[PDB]
Every structure is written in structure tokens, then in C-alpha cells.
Amino acid sequence: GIFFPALEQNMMGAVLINENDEVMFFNPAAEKLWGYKREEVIGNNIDMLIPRDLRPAHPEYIRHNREGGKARVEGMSRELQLEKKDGSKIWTRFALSKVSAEGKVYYLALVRDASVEMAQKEQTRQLIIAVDHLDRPVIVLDPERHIVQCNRAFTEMFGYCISEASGMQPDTLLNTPEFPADNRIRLQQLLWKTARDQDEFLLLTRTGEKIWIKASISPVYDVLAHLQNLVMTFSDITEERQIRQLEGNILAAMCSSPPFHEMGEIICRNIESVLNESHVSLFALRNGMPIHWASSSHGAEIQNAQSWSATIRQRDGAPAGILQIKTSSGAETSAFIERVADISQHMAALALEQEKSRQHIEQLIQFDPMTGLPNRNNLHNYLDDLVDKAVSPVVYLIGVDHIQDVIDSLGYAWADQALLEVVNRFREKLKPDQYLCRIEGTQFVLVSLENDVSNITQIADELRNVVSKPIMIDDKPFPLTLSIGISYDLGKNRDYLLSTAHNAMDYIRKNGGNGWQFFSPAMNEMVKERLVLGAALKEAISNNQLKLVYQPQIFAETGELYGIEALARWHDPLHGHVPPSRFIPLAEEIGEIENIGRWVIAEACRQLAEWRSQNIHIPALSVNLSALHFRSNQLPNQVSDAMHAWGIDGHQLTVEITESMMMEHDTEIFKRIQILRDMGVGLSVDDFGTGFSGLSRLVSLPVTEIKIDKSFVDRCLTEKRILALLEAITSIGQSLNLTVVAEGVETKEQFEMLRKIHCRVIQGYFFSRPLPAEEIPGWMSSVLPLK
Amino acid sequence: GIFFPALEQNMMGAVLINENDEVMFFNPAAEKLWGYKREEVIGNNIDMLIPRDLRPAHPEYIRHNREGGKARVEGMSRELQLEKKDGSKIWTRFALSKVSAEGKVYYLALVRDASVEMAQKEQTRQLIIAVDHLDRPVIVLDPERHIVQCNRAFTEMFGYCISEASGMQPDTLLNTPEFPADNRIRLQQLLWKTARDQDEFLLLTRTGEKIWIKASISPVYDVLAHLQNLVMTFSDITEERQIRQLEGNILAAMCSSPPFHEMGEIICRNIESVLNESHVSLFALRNGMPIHWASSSHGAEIQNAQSWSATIRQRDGAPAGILQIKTSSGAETSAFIERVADISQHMAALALEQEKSRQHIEQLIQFDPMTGLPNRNNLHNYLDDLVDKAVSPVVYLIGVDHIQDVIDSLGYAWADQALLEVVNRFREKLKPDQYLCRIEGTQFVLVSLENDVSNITQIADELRNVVSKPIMIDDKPFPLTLSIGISYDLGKNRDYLLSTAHNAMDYIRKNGGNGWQFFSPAMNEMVKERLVLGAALKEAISNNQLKLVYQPQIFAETGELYGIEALARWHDPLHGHVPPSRFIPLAEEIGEIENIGRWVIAEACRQLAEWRSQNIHIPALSVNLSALHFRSNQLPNQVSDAMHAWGIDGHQLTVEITESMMMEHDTEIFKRIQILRDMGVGLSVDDFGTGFSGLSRLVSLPVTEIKIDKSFVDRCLTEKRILALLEAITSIGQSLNLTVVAEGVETKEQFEMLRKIHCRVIQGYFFSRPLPAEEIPGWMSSVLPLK
Ligand code: HEM
Numbered sequence A, B: 001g002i003f004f005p006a007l008e009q010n011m012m013g014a015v016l017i018n019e020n021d022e023v024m025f026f027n028p029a030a031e032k033l034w035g036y037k038r039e040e041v042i043g044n045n046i047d048m049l050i051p052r053d054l055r056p057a058h059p060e061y062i063r064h065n066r067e068g069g070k071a072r073v074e075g076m077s078r079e080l081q082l083e084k085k086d087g088s089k090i091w092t093r094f095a096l097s098k099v100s101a102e103g104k105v106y107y108l109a110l111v112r113d114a115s116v117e118m119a120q121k122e123q124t125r126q127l128i129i130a131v132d133h134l135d136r137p138v139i140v141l142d143p144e145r146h147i148v149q150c151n152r153a154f155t156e157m158f159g160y161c162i163s164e165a166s167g168m169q170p171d172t173l174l175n176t177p178e179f180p181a182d183n184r185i186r187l188q189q190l191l192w193k194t195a196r197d198q199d200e201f202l203l204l205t206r207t208g209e210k211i212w213i214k215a216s217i218s219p220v221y222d223v224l225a226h227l228q229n230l231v232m233t234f235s236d237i238t239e240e241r242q243i244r245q246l247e248g249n250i251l252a253a254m255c256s257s258p259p260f261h262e263m264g265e266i267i268c269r270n271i272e273s274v275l276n277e278s279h280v281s282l283f284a285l286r287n288g289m290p291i292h293w294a295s296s297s298h299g300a301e302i303q304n305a306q307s308w309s310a311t312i313r314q315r316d317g318a319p320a321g322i323l324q325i326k327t328s329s330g331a332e333t334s335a336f337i338e339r340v341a342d343i344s345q346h347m348a349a350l351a352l353e354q355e356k357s358r359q360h361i362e363q364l365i366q367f368d369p370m371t372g373l374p375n376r377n378n379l380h381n382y383l384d385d386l387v388d389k390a391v392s393p394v395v396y397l398i399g400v401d402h403i404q405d406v407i408d409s410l411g412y413a414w415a416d417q418a419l420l421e422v423v424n425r426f427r428e429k430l431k432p433d434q435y436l437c438r439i440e441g442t443q444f445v446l447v448s449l450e451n452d453v454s455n456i457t458q459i460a461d462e463l464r465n466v467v468s469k470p471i472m473i474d475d476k477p478f479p480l481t482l483s484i485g486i487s488y489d490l491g492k493n494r495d496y497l498l499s500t501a502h503n504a505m506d507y508i509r510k511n512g513g514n515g516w517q518f519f520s521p522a523m524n525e526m527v528k529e530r531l532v533l534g535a536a537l538k539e540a541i542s543n544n545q546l547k548l549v550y551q552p553q554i555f556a557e558t559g560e561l562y563g564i565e566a567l568a569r570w571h572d573p574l575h576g577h578v579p580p581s582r583f584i585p586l587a588e589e590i591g592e593i594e595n596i597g598r599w600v601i602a603e604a605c606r607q608l609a610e611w612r613s614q615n616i617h618i619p620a621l622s623v624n625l626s627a628l629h630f631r632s633n634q635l636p637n638q639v640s641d642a643m644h645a646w647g648i649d650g651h652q653l654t655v656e657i658t659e660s661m662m663m664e665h666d667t668e669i670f671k672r673i674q675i676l677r678d679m680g681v682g683l684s685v686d687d688f689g690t691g692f693s694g695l696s697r698l699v700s701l702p703v704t705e706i707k708i709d710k711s712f713v714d715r716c717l718t719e720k721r722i723l724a725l726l727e728a729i730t731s732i733g734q735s736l737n738l739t740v741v742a743e744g745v746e747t748k749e750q751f752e753m754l755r756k757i758h759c760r761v762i763q764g765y766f767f768s769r770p771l772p773a774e775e776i777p778g779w780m781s782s783v784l785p786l787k
């Protein structure tokens, strides 16, 4: 038979199975397939040829193709995986056909090895993901200018599928608007142009919005140099420019250097604004852990959405952040999401880098560029030094308040200068011991060592008075004040001091600002009682409750009377017998020293005159002006008025002017005081001048009394180190014809020591304790002399 | 036999041709394929079934196969366009097999259609062309992470195509430098990521080049949700990487806020780095006109140079500048030039906006917000007020220089920190009366009010020393220098002074990297001449070429010469006859304060040795040492050494010091004076003691004699108080044999004016003008007394 040699020498594996599913034929092509030899399977069940794992399902196909023939179908050709005798599940092309061999229902199966074309199909399967995956849409056109294949970017960019765009003109697919009318002419010209070309089109999506597309056509010929294909690519220019301006705006915002979470939120907001129908949010990396960096308020869930992840990497190293964007299906094309993701990721890397650099910068900056002052870093060391040296530091926290008005009105450009002006006033005001710092924003710190209550009640006042007059901006005033808290304690660490200072600083502002306070309620009480005492002193001068007392002075060599001294004296049921060691500085703080001294001298004069008018006389009275410092320009005015109140008898009066030199700062006092001698008052001095030999010890000044203070005589009896200077002062008195008085003496031994040196007047608890205004007349009417 | 039905009833197209090209077998499948009938086909030439246009060569192919053997190929297969009997042409897969009957040559043809396969092949060529048309590389990776496909972009940009790349790891396929930034591990891990990711990598071409690829890996899953393929896209981030570096650098710049011109220069540097041989220019817009803000310095001639412009607009879109890029003709790709235009323009946009704001506020700002120092306008108003008041200042143009080191190494932030550090030194050292501002950039200006050349040079030298110490920052201290220009002219405007000082600073900076001078060299020579004089004094004191004069003091009583006072002199031929009032301050300036005094005392002791041999019995010898300013660092040891040098006990030697100088350090000074007491060396204090008047009487025993200054003795007509000074001295004089010395007597009338006051010693020109070293014996022999 002719069919015998052709079947025998054939390159396709032909096999036949009887109606009972048993095989009866094989060939060398079948041997190239499977692997079994002919005799191994001739007359045996087909199941052995069937794959071992496929045998359970084969009977179903057998029944379907025998009982009903799969709806009376002889067979078909298709691909199937063949498990060769070596166990390899190779791929081959199978074909089936019902046959009537021997009058029975037999089935003939043809097989062909298909490894090579299977590899071609693998190439195509990779190439389809290579085409769907792409940065821009691309579609190839046959000689008749019909769309044949497209990509996922094309589909998601124009709302079209391959089924919808198959075999149809690009313009017919993207039906163009009639406005302008030349769009059709231009697109035809470009599409039918035989050479590579580019142009711009105004396509409108199947689902809506217009896109100003930039389309390009390129040719591809064949061996015969004939038109084989024309590849057309629709690069986006509308959304492409949207991403370009997205990067531009992200860089613009980042150039202002806003804080970390602000940068994250800005990036998220803009990313969503471009890739609408999505949410975005970033995570930062710290200590090898992710922390939610920023998010936009539009975090609502959207159906049919997919996540999309990227990693933030700085100049090198592990990630600095995690990028995640959830986008709803149909929101925007995948390549466009890629375009947004790359820019967002690189911009986020730069954002992380900026914060990282700012960390090391701020942590080590030793001066804040605004105001150029020291900052927290320097203040930390300048407080650690003091705390470890154990010298009690005092920390004031200043807060500028009522500032936001300038920021709102003129803007930051002028609000910065407004702060700098006050900071410069601080510098012009402060002193070498003090240290200044600007910790953050409108908050500053002052470090001091002098920590007396009366010192702080003045430093705080200076700091708060710095801003009395308004700040001049644009020649227009803009007021400000300060809330200043004072921390002062021993032992506690700088951290405790700063915490307390900030507590007080915020507390003052919350109460209303424009003020100052200590941290300690007890220390605040202290000043409350001080203020009450000051008001009481005001009322006291008003109501004439203070008095004066007299300390007798005697000629040390004879026992005759020499003078009396007017020691101020305060009496009060609310506070008992306060001493001049405490009630004078209160008068200085309250500014009533003027009335204090006025009443003192006035009552001294009135007592002197009312005793002169009676049958009693005394050598003189000495009022110590230096105690209240009596240093205003009315220094002679007050005494002149008081003396004129009852006539001028300066010869009967003495005055003490022990300002360290009384001319070291104000020469007007000296130039005007000569009226005292003109009236006859007895000038007196305690200290010894320094410069120019104390102005040649002012022989021109008619000094009368030289007073050796209490301490000198108190310490004299022990040491010749003081006996020598006592000798010198007494000798110079005796030589320059000056009367020397000693303001202290306790027991007979001190008086014995002072006797030999020829001291002229001695006063102290020895001769007579101070005796009030009511019975010193009795003492003088009784005792003369006292030795 | 089944061999007949095996083919006769087959559905696959089958034909057979014998040696004579006659069709011997033609199956019903072949009938339904071609359209002929079996009877019409059998016995006819095979060419009838061949396409008419291809028939002529078919017999030639058959003859070639019959004769040449063709390596006895058993069979083959392919697709060709079959022509049917009706003339229609279709694509039909087919295969050829070689069979032999009766020992002759026969050929068997098998045929199927697979027209959908031809359509898929058309789709496959289309996929290849679609992916290959775009220049972005894409590759596909099997599950095991082996690259299994490539495209034209990848092969062109990496050398390896698929053939030499398939079936191996991408990390090995892609070679990297030796872990420059740990690139190997990053590539390995990213290649192993299971979720979509993207990073950057250095990859070296076949030749070997440092190119950067933005590897972007994405997975593709199957229908059953398993990892199926890994497709990645290496976008060549080289232009993109360059823009990344550009953005980072310019972001760092704009954050650090450099000056506007340096910002433009940085922009130009980056622009030329990304575009070699570029003549880029930033034509900003000022007052509606294009102003050259900056440009790249490489303006070399270019043939048909490519020119482009980018528009710089504010937030509202109004034009504000033009980035004009000029480059080699067509040397820049459109896709990359577009970005170096847009991104650079949009980053410079905020620079321009901030600069416009700063320019609007420039005429009004009063405080530079980087150093806190007053800006140019404050200084201008201050100098205007000073000149209106007729105050000529000295503009210490402190040109803080060498800052370029920190600028190039650590950048603008740490440059500002160093500037704040140096202004900290200036602020702490400047005296209250001085003023300091910042005229521009790094040029500070410290306005003072010192006209003395000595004070000016002292301020310059102390500024130089305070800047000399390394300026610590970031634990890498940098040395810094100053170029202090100075000027001083009465009645000249601020413009005159600031032009002069600026020109002087420029002149000195040009002549050297450090120094300081005046403008108008007419007076700059003063520093050089005084320095030469200082060197000459150094030489003279080292050589011991000075001289001494011995002025005697004559008793106001009837007596012999009380003593001598030794006064150091100097006589040189070149520098003139230098007086004491000149060289003593020069001695302090040059640092021989202790050395000159040591010479003075040594000469005094040697001359004491010389005198005693003759009848010169040395009543007493005072060697001053007050104007020479002995410090405690060298006083006791050196002053005492001269005592033993020639055997003269202190009973005649005398030193002098002012208590105003003793008060400099009260801790130890007079201890050495007591050592001198033990040695017998007397101490004659100055005009009078300072405060407390006691150290001049106890522990120390001065007032062995005390001297009255000539300025007072000759001015007694107004300084009449020196009479009381004399009597105060007389007190302790009669106490323990102490004495006064009125120095400066010039007439017998002054002698009468003094002697009435019981002064014991008279000195001055009148009784005896100073005598040369060797005439003391003559004066002694001649005058006893003169009266
Ligand atoms: C590697 C060996 C084999 C494999 C992998 C295999 C697999 C399959 C599978 C999965 C089907 C379901 C329908 C389809 O896939 O098209 C099928 C159908 C069928 N199989 Fe097999 N089979 C093998 C061997 C054979 C052989 C040699 C025969 C000989 C007749 C056979 C008899 C049939 C029949 C008659 C059908 C009906 C298909 C139709 O009518 O379209 N099987 N085969």
C-alpha cells in the first residue's frame, strides 16, 4: 500500500486507539516523543501513555468522546504538555480524529514536538509584559493604517482596550473635537506622512477630559525597503507637564526649608492633587524603625484600589523612608503613577537629607543666626560649668509678648527686625557677669551669679523695662512686653532650673503676660511682704510716725558734752522694731528716700529750735545723710528749706556727707554744698579719698568732723594692724586741726586704748546708749561729766 | 492493514511525490486544503499545487534536493502562503519528510493551517518593534532571578545582549566597582526584593564606564496569584542623576542662604558641570529691564552656537528673568535640555522672589539678620550724625578674610558659624565706646574714636591676636586672619572714609594674605618708623649702651646733699636724642619693661660701687622704678640681686612705687616691699596713698620720704592744698623721722614759697640741674650749701 511507507517514514508521531481505549500503533516520531518503544505499549491501555497525574481525569474525556462524542465532534488540534518517559513534561501539538477502522469507533491521535515554537511563545509571553510595561503608550500600524496592538499605558491613558481599538484608524478611535477644524487635517497629514514626524493633537478620552497629546510616527521597512510598519507613540504632554510642575512646586516648597512633617504633608498633598482618586502618606526611618511621617486628610477608602510602594534612599545606605500610595483603578495610568513615584521618592530623599543635616547643624550651632546670640547649646555648657562648680546660678527666662501684631501686619521681613531690636537693647543693657542666650523663637535666657533678693528685684526690673518705649518700625511704633520667670535654687540640676523657669515663663503669659515672677511661692511672698512694707513706709511718712533718737558725745579728755547724733528709728505693731540695716534699702527701692530725708532733717531742726527756745542748750546735732544717700539735686535744697523754717544757725549743726568721695560721679553736689559752710554748718567726712590724693584731701572743703566708724574701733583693741591706722588718723586730725570722733566703744579697755592716742570725741554704749526725744533732757540735766 | 486507514482517513493534509514529480498519494485532507480532486491530482506535476509565481523554481529546488543530497536531511517544517485551486492564497503550516519507495527518492508533505498562529507571529513582530522603538531598556527575569530577555536599549547601553546574558544572575552579569558605597549588597538585595521596588546603582559597561542606572523591578503574578515573572527597567540616570546632584547642591545653597551673586555663581557652576562648554547667563529682570545676574565664565567662541531661553516667573506667573543657555550646536539632547531648563529655572524662581523681597526691604532694614550687627544703613546714619557733630572716627574695616577655606570645605552654614564666632570675639573685646557693624558680606567695620597712632596700632594688634587663635568649629579648627584698613580725616564724609578704608583693605589684601594698614601711605610710614625705633631700642638695651644721670636733692634746711635720683637716659646718633617721656612708653610697647628696669638698677649699684671708693659717701640713691612699671613677675628677685653685686646695704638705696599701681594686685606686692625693708631698701611712695591710707603706714614702712610731683610743685598757685599735704607729711615726719621732697623748684621765689611750709628737701633745676655721670664729685666739692 502507498499509505504504508508514508506512515512508516513520517516525522509526526501517529498513534491509534481502539474503541476500548487501547493503543495499536506507534512510530519513530512517537519514539522521539514520549520515549516508550512500540512493543512496550502496543495492545496496552492508553492510560500508560496518559500522564500519571492526568489519568484520573482522562476517563471523563473518554466518556464524553464515546457516549456522545463531545456533542458529535471528531476531534481538534491544540497544544498539550507531554510527560516523556524521562519524566519531562514537554510541550507538543496534539490532534484528534474519530475513525471507523474495522467498522469500529476508533480514535487516531497525531503528535508533533513543539519545543522550539513553545520557546517562541515564551518569548512572546515575556514580550507582552514588556509591551504592557512601558513608560509611554506605543501602537504599531500596518500598511492600511489600522491599530493592531497596544499597551496597558495606552489603555489607562485613553480609556480604550485592544478589542475597542482593533483594526481601526487612530482618529476614528480618538474622535477629535471639531474645534479647531484643522485637527483632522493635521492628524491625517501626520498619519499618512511617509517619514518620521511629530505633531500635537487635542484628543478627548473615551471617558472625558481633553489631553493635549504629543504624537510621533516612525517608519520601519523590511529587506525590500518597503513600508512594513509605522510605529505611533502618544506621549502625554498635559499630564507630563503636570508632573513637571509637580516637581517644580515640590522643589519650590522644599526650598523654604519647612519642618519635617510639614514637608511630608506638602508632598502628600501635591502627590494626591496630581494623582487624584488616591491617597498617599510617607513614613520616616528613625532608630531602624518606621514612624508615620505625614498624611493628607483625604484618607477615605476607595473601591477597586491597589497599593504602590517605593523606598527613600539618601546619598547612600539603608532606606530613610517608606513611600506608599493607594490608587483606585482607573484613576491614572500605571506609567504615570511611576512618573509621580520616582519624583516623590527622590524629593523625599532630599527632604530626609535636609532634616538630617539640620539635626547635626542645630545640635552643634554655638550662635543663632537670628540676633547672633548664644543658643541652647552654649547655655547648656554655661550652666553645667556653674552647677558643677556649685556656685548658685540664677536663670531668668524672658518671653517677648504681644508680638504677633507686627508679624501679621508688616510680615516676617519686619518681624525679624522687631525682635533683633529688643535683642540689641538687651546687649546694650547687660553686664559682664551676666550671660545671654536665645533658646527658641521669642524666648531668651539670662544666667547670673549675683543672687540676692534685692539684686534680682532690680535685674528683673531692668529686663522688663528694656521694652518700655515702643519699637520703631517704618517710623510707626509697635508695642511689646515681656513675661519673665526667675529660677533660683541650689543643688538642683540645670534641667530642674530650666523646667522651673519655663513653668514660670508660661504661667505669667497665661495669667496675661506683661510681667515677672519668681518660681517659688515663698520667694514671691517675700516680695509681697516687701511691697506691703513699702506701702506702710509711705503711710508712715504721710502720718509722721517715725522718730529720732540722740547718742550723747563727750569731750574724751574733760567729760564735757560735744554733740548728739540723729539715728533714724522705725516702730510698728505689724513688724516690730525694724533696723536701719533693712528699712533704708526698702525706701531706696520704693523711691521715698526723698521724703524720708526731708522729714528727718525737718524734725531735727524743729527739735533743735524748740529746745533753743527753752532753757536748754546743746553743742550740736549730726544727721547722717549718707545713710539714705540723699544724692538728688535737692540735697542742699531740702536742708536749706528745713533750716530756714526756723532760722539759720549752721554753727549749731553738723552734717555727714560720706559718699565714697561725693565727687566721683556728680560734681554738682560739691559745687553747690558750699552754702552749708556759708551758713555755718559743720561739714564732716568718714572715708578717705583715693584719686589725686583724694583731691589733695580737699583742704578747700571745710571738713570739720572725721568719724572713725564702728568696725575700726571694734577691731582695734586686738591688732596693732588697726592701732597703727588709728594712730595715723588721730595724728593727721591733730595736725590739720580737725576734730576726730569715734563711733563705737563698749568697755573700759577699749576706752583706755583710745585715750592715749588723744582721740577727741568718743561715742558708744559706754558713755550713753541712745536716749529718746523725751528723756535725754533729763539725762543732760543730771549728768555732767560722765567720768 | 491499519496502515491504509492510518493515512487515507487522516484529517491532516498529506501529499506524496515520486521521482517524476508526480503526485502518488493525495489525502482527503489535502483535497479540502487545496481544492483539487484526488483523481485530478494523481499523476500530475507537483507544480500545479505550487503558487503560480513560485512554480518555475520549484522543479529546480526538487532537482537540487535530489542531486546535492543536502547532508541527507530527514525532514523540516515551516510556514508558507499556500495557493488554492481558485487562486486564493492562505498561510498553512507544513512539514517535509524524505521517504523512499522501491529504492527511489520520494517526498512527503504534511500540512495544517495554524492561521491564528500566523496572526500571532504578526503580533510578535509587532511586539518586538513596539518595545524596540522606545529607547528605555526593559528586561524579564525568571522566578530564579535570571535575566532571560533584553532589548535594543539594554544592549546598546550595556554591551551584553540576550545571547551572552541569558540564564545568569543580574548581579554577576553587571559588574560594579569595589564597594565604593556598598553597591554590591544593595544590588543583591534589590534583585531579591519580592515587592515592587527601585534603587540606583553604579554599573560598568563592557569597556568600563561609571554610569548610573535607576533599577526598577516589578513582579507580575499569574491568574492563580503566584510570582510569575520579574520585569525591570534600567532608566539611565545620568542626565537625571546630574539633575539630582544639581537639585541637592542648590537646595543646600538656598537653605544656607548665601549672597545673591554667589547663589548665581553656584547655579552657573552646576549648569556648566551638567553642560560642559556652556555660556549660560541668568538675565534677571530689574525695573523692567534685563540685568546680568551672572553667567558661566566659559564664553569661548562656538560655531552656530545653540541658544535657548527659559522664563523665570514669580508665584503669580509674571516674568522675572530669563535663563539663556548657550551651548555647542546640537550637543544637547532635547529631553535633557528641557529639564536643565525647567528645573533650574523653577529653583532659581524662589531665589529671585526672595531677592526681590530683600531688595524691596534693603533700603529700610537696620539689622543684618545673620550676625545681629547693625547693617549698612545704621552705620550710615551713625556716621552722618558723627560728621554733623564734627566727630572724625577711625573706620577699622575689619575685613575678616581667609573665610574661603571654610566656604570651600564645610560650606555656607559653617561659614556663618565661623563669622558668628569671630564677631563673638569682637563683641566681647570691644570697649563700651566702640561701635561695630557689617557693611557687606564678610567685611565688618568697627567705628572707634581713637586718633593716637599708638592706640590705633594697639587696637589693630589686639584684634589680630584675638583672631590669631584657631577658630574652632566641628572639631576642626581653622586659622583666620584680618586685613584692618584704617583712616582718619577731619571733616570728610562717610563716603570719603568708607572709600579710603575699603581701598586700603584691598591694597593690603592684595599685597599679602594678612596684615593691617592705613590708607594714604603718606602716614602709613609711622608704623614702620616706630617699629624700627623699637628694634633699635631692643639692640641698645641688649648691648647695654644706655646712660644714667644723677640729680641731687638739696635740703630746705641747712645741710649737705640729701641724696641723688637716678634717671635713665638714651643718646643715639641715628634715631635722635630720645627723651624718657618718649622711650618709656616705647619700652612698654616693645616689651622691655622689666629689662630696662633691671639695667637701671644694675647701673645704679655699679655706680654705687664706683662712688664709695672716693670721698663720695652716697647720702642716698633713689632709683625710681615707678614710671618703669615693674610687675610682680620680676620685681623681688631681680631688684634684690643688685644688692650683693658690689656690697651696698639698703641703708642708702631707695625704690618708688605708687599705691595706685600697688592696688593692681593687693595679694602679694607689699610682701616684696617688706623684703626690701629687711634689706634696708627704702620706699618713697608717690604723691600720696590711696584709700584707707594705712598700707602707706603699716606692714609696709613707706614715707621714709614722700615726693610731690613737679606738676603740683610748679602749679602750687592753684594746687595750694600741697601745703596741707606738706603738714600731713610733717606729722609722721616728727613722729618717726620721715621726710617730704618737693620736686620741681625752679626759682628762689618758689624756694621762699615752699620753705615757709616746713619742707625739708628741695629739688629741681634751680639748685642743681642734672649733672653728667662724672660731675657729682665736682658739685659736692663746690656747693655746700648755696642758699
Ligand atoms: C501526553 C499525553 C496526553 C495528554 C497530556 C493528554 C491530555 C488531554 C487533555 C487535558 C484533554 C482535555 C481536552 C483538551 O485538553 O483539549 C484531552 C482530551 C482528549 N484526550 Fe488526551 N492526553 C494525552 C494522551 C492521549 C492520547 C494519545 C489520546 C488518543 C486518542 C487521548 C485521548 C483523548 C481524547 C479522545 C480527547 C478528547 C479531546 C477532544 O475531543 O477535543 N489522550 N487530552
Ligand code: HEM
Binding pocket: B015, B016, B017, B046, B049, B050, B051, B054, B061, B062, B064, B065, B070, B076, B080, B081, B082, B083, B096, B107, B108, B109
Ligand atoms: C504551498 C505549497 C508549497 C510551497 C509554497 C512550497 C515552497 C517551497 C520553497 C520556497 C522551497 C525552497 C526551500 C525552502 O523554502 O526552504 C521548497 C522546497 C521543497 N519543496 Fe516545496 N512548496 C510547496 C509544496 C510542496 C509539496 C506538497 C511538496 C511535497 C513533497 C514539496 C516538496 C519540496 C521539497 C522536497 C523541497 C526541498 C527542501 C530542501 O531541499 O530543503 N513542496 N518548497
